[PDB]
């Protein structure tokens, strides 16, 4: 689970990539990707 | 992703199974399981 999903977490931390970006770039569903963005504080706050 | 994880979502809705239960019962990591409990409103509020 944290094999291919982890690398995606590092991608957001470098370019604040959105869910579609993480999912479309790596392949993880829109939910697993949103978890990365949801974890991001700078992105969490609107 | 929603193949084996889905069935687990229904398990919590029938016995409010904790993360360890969902993960230990089905096999999903502690995170994917916590997502089920986290979604539960009755369990969300402490
Ligand atoms: Zn971000
Ligand atoms: Zn519950």
UniProtKB/Swiss-Prot annotation, chains A, B:
Integrase-type zinc-finger residues: 3-44
Binding of Zn(2+), residues: 12, 16, 40, 43
Membrane-spanning parts: none
Location of the protein in the cell: Virion; Host nucleus; Host cytoplasm
Self-association and partners: Homotetramer; may further associate as a homohexadecamer. Part of the pre-integration complex (PIC) which is composed of viral genome, matrix protein, Vpr and integrase. Interacts with human SMARCB1/INI1 and human PSIP1/LEDGF isoform 1. Interacts with human KPNA3; this interaction might play a role in nuclear import of the pre-integration complex. Interacts with human NUP153; this interaction might play a role in nuclear import of the pre-integration complex.
Role played: Catalyzes viral DNA integration into the host chromosome, by performing a series of DNA cutting and joining reactions. This enzyme activity takes place after virion entry into a cell and reverse transcription of the RNA genome in dsDNA. The first step in the integration process is 3' processing. This step requires a complex comprising the viral genome, matrix protein, Vpr and integrase. This complex is called the pre-integration complex (PIC). The integrase protein removes 2 nucleotides from each 3' end of the viral DNA, leaving recessed CA OH's at the 3' ends.
Domain comment quoted from the record: The core domain contains the D-x(n)-D-x(35)-E motif, named for the phylogenetically conserved glutamic acid and aspartic acid residues and the invariant 35 amino acid spacing between the second and third acidic residues. Each acidic residue of the D,D(35)E motif is independently essential for the 3'-processing and strand transfer activities of purified integrase protein.
Designated name of the protein: Integrase
Species in which this protein is naturally found: Human immunodeficiency virus type 2 subtype A (isolate ROD) (HIV-2)
Lineage: Viruses, Riboviria, Pararnavirae, Artverviricota, Revtraviricetes
Full-length numbering of the shown residues: 1172 to 1217 of 1464
């Amino acid at each position: 689970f944290l094999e291919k999903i982890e690398p995606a977490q590092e991608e957001h931390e470098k370019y604040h990539s959105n869910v579609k970006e993480l999912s479309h770039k790596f392949g993880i569903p829109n939910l697993v990707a949103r978890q990365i963005v949801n974890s991001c504080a700078q992105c969490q706050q609107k």
